[PDB]
Amino acid sequence: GCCANPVCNGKHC
Numbered sequence: 001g002c003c004a005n006p007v008c009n010g011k012h013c
Contacts (some may be wrong), residue, residue, distance in 0.1 A: 001013070
């Protein structure tokens with residue numbers, strides 16, 4: 001997942 005990523009958190013999470 002990419003929810004741990006600062007931006008992808010709010011993107012794909």
